[PDB]
Amino acid sequence: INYWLAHAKAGYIVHWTA
Numbered sequence: 001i002n003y004w005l006a007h008a009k010a011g012y013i014v015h016w017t018a
Contacts, residue, residue, distance in 0.1 A: 001016065001018055002016060002017075002018060003016060
């Protein structure tokens with residue numbers, strides 16, 4: 001879990017949370 005990777009790849013940036 002916790003698939004941030006916030007970088008780009010089509011605004012792959014998210015905001016999950018355990």
